[PDB]
Amino acid sequence: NPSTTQARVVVDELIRGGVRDVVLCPGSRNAPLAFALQDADRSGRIRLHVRIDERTAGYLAIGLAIGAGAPVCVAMTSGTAVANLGPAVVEANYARVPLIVLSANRPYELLGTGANQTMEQLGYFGTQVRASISLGLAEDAPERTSALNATWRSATCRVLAAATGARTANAGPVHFDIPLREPTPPGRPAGKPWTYTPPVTFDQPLDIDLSVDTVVISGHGAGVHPNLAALPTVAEPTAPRSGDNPLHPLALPLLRPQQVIMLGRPTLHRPVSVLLADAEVPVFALTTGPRWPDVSGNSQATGTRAVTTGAPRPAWLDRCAAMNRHAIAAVREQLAAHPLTTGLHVAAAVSHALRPGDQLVLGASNPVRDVALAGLDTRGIRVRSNRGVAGIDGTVSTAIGAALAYEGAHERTGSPDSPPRTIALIGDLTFVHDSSGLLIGPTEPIPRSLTIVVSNDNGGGIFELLEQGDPRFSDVSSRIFGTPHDVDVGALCRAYHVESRQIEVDELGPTLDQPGAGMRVLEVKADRSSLRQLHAAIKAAL
Amino acid sequence: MNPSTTQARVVVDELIRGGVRDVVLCPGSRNAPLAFALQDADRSGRIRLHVRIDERTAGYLAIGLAIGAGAPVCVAMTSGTAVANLGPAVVEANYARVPLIVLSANRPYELLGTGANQTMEQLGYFGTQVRASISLGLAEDAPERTSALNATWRSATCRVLAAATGARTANAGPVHFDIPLREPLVPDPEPLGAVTPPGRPAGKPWTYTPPVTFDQPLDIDLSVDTVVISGHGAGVHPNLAALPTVAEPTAPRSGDNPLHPLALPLLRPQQVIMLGRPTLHRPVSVLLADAEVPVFALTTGPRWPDVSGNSQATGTRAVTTGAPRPAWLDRCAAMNRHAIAAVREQLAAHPLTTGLHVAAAVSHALRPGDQLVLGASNPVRDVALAGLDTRGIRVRSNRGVAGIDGTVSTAIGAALAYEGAHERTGSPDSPPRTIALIGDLTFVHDSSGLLIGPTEPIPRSLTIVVSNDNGGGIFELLGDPRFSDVSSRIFGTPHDVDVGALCRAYHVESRQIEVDELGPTLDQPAGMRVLEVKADRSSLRQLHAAIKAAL
Amino acid sequence: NPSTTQARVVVDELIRGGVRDVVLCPGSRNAPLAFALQDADRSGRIRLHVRIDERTAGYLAIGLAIGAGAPVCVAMTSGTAVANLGPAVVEANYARVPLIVLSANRPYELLGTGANQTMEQLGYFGTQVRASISLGLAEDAPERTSALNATWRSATCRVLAAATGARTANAGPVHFDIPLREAVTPPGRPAGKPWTYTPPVTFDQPLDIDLSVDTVVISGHGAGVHPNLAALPTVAEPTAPRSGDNPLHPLALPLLRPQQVIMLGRPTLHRPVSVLLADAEVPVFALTTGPRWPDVSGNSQATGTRAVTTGAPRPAWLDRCAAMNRHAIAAVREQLAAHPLTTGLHVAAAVSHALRPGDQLVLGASNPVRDVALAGLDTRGIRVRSNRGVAGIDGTVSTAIGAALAYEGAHERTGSPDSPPRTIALIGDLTFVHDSSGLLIGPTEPIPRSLTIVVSNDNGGGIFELLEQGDPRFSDVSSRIFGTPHDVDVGALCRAYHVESRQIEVDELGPTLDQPGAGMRVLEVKADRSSLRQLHAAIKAAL
């Protein structure tokens, strides 16, 4: 059958392209490439992950992709797949995650006369994906086997290149259709991809004078810039650090920088937003890819690297370092003097328990910010967070997939050491949102060293710190923003046969130092009724 | 009053004037103007607010609130993936023709593509699944044209409601209503006591559009041997009431001459009248796939199903000439009695409680006035197999796409709307019962739909029966492709998820009982509860073979 | 050959669905259904129209549909076809024209890796079409011939149903794909009947309206006929069918104080109409068919499909309106007589005077369609066409040509032994230059027998003289960027395409229209726009 030959050629090319994991869901029909994928899974060339929940499957693919940087395929055939995959595909587009969405249209059947069990289509594919490629239906022609093998492998390498950003430096989701009718020609020698894409550079140098009082702000997707390593740097948790001179986010409003270098895409902290929008401050955007971040439109120039003249005034560096120490002190002490555990205490504890080579996975809301408020030093750490569109959905499967991909890479190094830990920190709403991600059949890969820390303040803590958190809304905000739920986390973990423990904040460190089952949830109860006061006390101690 | 608060209050007001009684809300900062406005309407009793955490299952809750009493229902959420999480419920609402209003907050459209946090292409995200995609203009600070802005906001809100209820189209469905909103997003400390721009006098909708009467008479001769097949969304046809009728559980009965689905392949209809959209029964599909028998499609709206290649004509109602042969009605009535007798006998002779036994017991417990919610895979198949008489009861099921998402939330939402509709009657009697029958995989999958926050409305009389055979009604009853497909390997091992632990996790009363206690337990109440009945799946294929042999 | 069987089944069902005309263009590959359509053309079962310009070809299809109300197919395979069809597809959506766009995708070929010279997609199909249906590849299964013939014919009826609004009362464009791999044909129903028959449908939404309140009727594009409203003063657009005989000149409207408005169809003309419809003190009742209702300001009180009336207009009100109508008809005619130069308004008044029952009238956007209304044309017994969906000045020549062909075809189908009725088109000069391509028709292709295109040529855009940018403080700037003079030799253009042409004066227009010429002719009448604004100022002052 030409369709089975074609499917094996594609799967083979996908494996040479660096795909190591494929996610699937049961549906109305067989998945695309199902048998060739099954053969490769059995042979150990790739690893399959199956889930019933199509939404959590999309996010499992994201995690499997950002854990070690590899392209990941997700393949489902059902009438709800496109709708359920939407959230993950949007995150993959905005965070530039190489996600390949496989489909298998049927050209011998009617479309548009009723509900389609294979693909029920929304409007986001047009706007979200880097490419939409459909292989031909496989012709029955042994005469043309060599020419078809070339066409198929060329097209597969185009899918892979579009998703990884190999030539565009703009990785993201790709829609790859392999049609079939209802009801192996080799690749390049020595395992090379059919169409090889050697390394590319996009170079856009900007002239910047460092003698001007400069602060670096690095956000999601920031590059590494050695020539900027000495400047005071307010770094989001997921930004790689270029140097060793951190500036705490809370210190920023008490300095007066005269220019800003912005790396990647900042999304955290109102003081950062305000500074980038200040008309009297030059802002230089250094980022990869086609677009640049600039909500205010205030930025002066954008490129990919800086060509620097001068150096920072010693008085400026020394003044930034003293506000940095005052902010660190203000947090440590007001946390010490607070009589109730909050998410900020939980984040502080997780940050101390971390060691080099760990992978940290951060939920949206307070956790990703609290870790920054606690001054976590991210050097030697891989920090992952779905900052593309900052959803609270799918964070459990993202952590699981990230642990799996990260352990898989460490395994392949052959090293005798135990698999490096993955530690997730997420809020209680975030955990309830994607609890279904906890359900993993015995037939499926399970992380060996994943700890999910759930900081549970029985609602949405971040909203205590916004305008709706003002006391004049006290009666009203509790229901429509606090959103309390009274979930028994321990029961939920028991229901899914997931090792679970409820501990106090000071036991968090010790518990995380002691290894446990491959996958486990550590719940720490927290309070959010006092959170706006705690943050007010930290500000006043600045 | 700042522009965001003013706009939000005008929109919420016009939605209430348009007949919206329930609103599902999920938390966020960008939708804060909507959340404040809705909670004010809740506090003064103009609507009933339901807050949820998970946008996805929250959309099926809204679906339940819409199908329970027949009213348009809004779900409101923040910008970004929160909106994308409504996709699954939008698809169901489209195919099941449910008046679901997705009311999303957005950033100003000019911020698209600037790197703004939690922003995405929202307008048109759903494509052709929605009846309409409507946007409001960003609210300007310009009091001189407050009354002009009031008119455009209420008109837009009236277009949303008309598209969703099908007031002009006769084709209800979901509508995307996107509202770009900018700071300030919370109500100002001052002015105190501002006045929201007024709607029409006497609470009338700003632009009033009455429900269309859509009519398409079609001639049909009843003397030709006729079977009626009615599926999801079918209408009632008194002049067809005497015909033998294979009716899906969700189809309203027009008459009293039932024909069991198993009997149909053993009869020889010479023509078919197809009511609504029948998807459920394999015997039905086989018959409709046969291009030789003439089929007439009677539907309540402009859509008609593609299940038959030989639909001769479409209509909304038949104009009947003649009457059926008494011998033909005799023949069908005899096969009906035979078909159900085979089922009840083989059921009684089977030594193990299967999901079919649970469905038979549930069907036997119901009385007129009950609402019954069925998970759209096997529970709806089994209840029909057991021969449930649906006269005088409301059967709800997500038969649009018959997916697995949101079945629990839909049961909860149907119960709340149905009880509410009966609070308004004024009867002082206890609220009607809502009984849901859900399989264990479906219940586990949407278990988080059980979650109702302490401050949120709880059904007064919903019982969720879980027929737990520890794995699907899947590889029993087959589906040659499925044994080959590697994704089926998750179905080879019983999942063993503890149902009682799940009900504990969402603080819902749950008991585990035997099928014989089911009838008495349901007559007995107590708010919301789950009854888990364990069940065998191993003998299930043996049971169906015995029924097939008995025919 | 399976696709040959499929293609013939589809063409046969399309024919049974009332398709009489199909528009094609040469392209990189063969049009969908090309050989089945040829066979039907040869046999006189359908009529093929070929054009090289894909854009004019779409507007020709629009004309072939609106000329007698039939569904029309357009079939092009080229790398530019979707882009060139866009304008007509948008017009088909907004004017609710039953336009079927045929395509033929190749499922054995790669998509998305490079330029696609079979169909290069834009973003508009997802927002403009009523349906997008793909037949699916034809396979080699002779036993399933009955089942496949049923499936194909069903899908084709579903396509036709979506395009004509047979069940939705919402006609519009549909995308119909028949994919391709690269003499007995299975029969449809007895007696030429469609495979899935759709009996007549009604959408009924009655509204209670009190006629004793001082009421005016404004009817626009797509207005329906309402007997119970025939006596009210009615400001009608040229394309709106008249219900009665109490016209109310649009220039009269600002001089009356109506206390409620019944609005029929979709109004697009006259700023006094827009002002009245937006007046918060005036209840507005929108009566229209289809899913949506017009309401720019949001001021409307209710919408439906018909009126249930109580009461009757006060006789004082009727005479006040009938007299204000007389005042305005007279102010226009007297200041037209008093005006020194020929303007487009003069040309319109002359064309109005020359029309008679049985004629089809095609109006360009811009001043022509307004001027006919200001000239007080009586449209009873006259079929008035204009592309008011989006009011483009593009494609009006091919629209008039297609309208004429379809209207003539309807008359020839009767046995009448008469010269076919006249189609008279009135368009401005920019509009004519925009779609001049539509004049080029090969000897092989159908040509209207009685089409006369009148071109009111004021060497630019007359309508902008009458707008705010036409005020004298912009005299230097506006000439170039709104007037856009071109100095085209209209007679030389028509001679290049072998089209009978005459430059004539306005009094000469009635006589020339009375005796026929070649089947297609262009009558150019030179007009002035320099004095246009003051002419309208004179008519305002006279009121």
Ligand SMILES: Cc1ncc(C[n+]2c([C-](O)CCC(=O)O)sc(CCOP(=O)(O)OP(=O)(O)O)c2C)c(N)n1
């Ligand atoms: C699917 C979805 N639906 C809604 C939202 C809006 N939202 C957030 C956003 O405000 C967070 C934005 C950011 O930059 O992190 S943060 C949030 C509350 C999360 O509560 P939590 O998980 O208990 O964390 P907590 O520590 O209590 O802040 C909600 C509900 C969302 N982000 N995703």
Ligand SMILES: Cc1ncc(C[n+]2c([C-](O)CCC(=O)O)sc(CCOP(=O)(O)OP(=O)(O)O)c2C)c(N)n1
């Ligand atoms: C393709 C296209 N491109 C531009 C426009 C804008 N436009 C118009 C519009 O303003 C008229 C709209 C209406 O309601 O009639 S009217 C117009 C001038 C038409 O000049 P004309 O054909 O010589 O007519 P004239 O009698 O001189 O007014 C132009 C350029 C358009 N309508 N279509």
Ligand SMILES: [Mg+2]
């Ligand atoms: Mg929380």
Ligand SMILES: [Mg+2]
């Ligand atoms: Mg089960």
Ligand SMILES: [Mg+2]
């Ligand atoms: Mg002109």
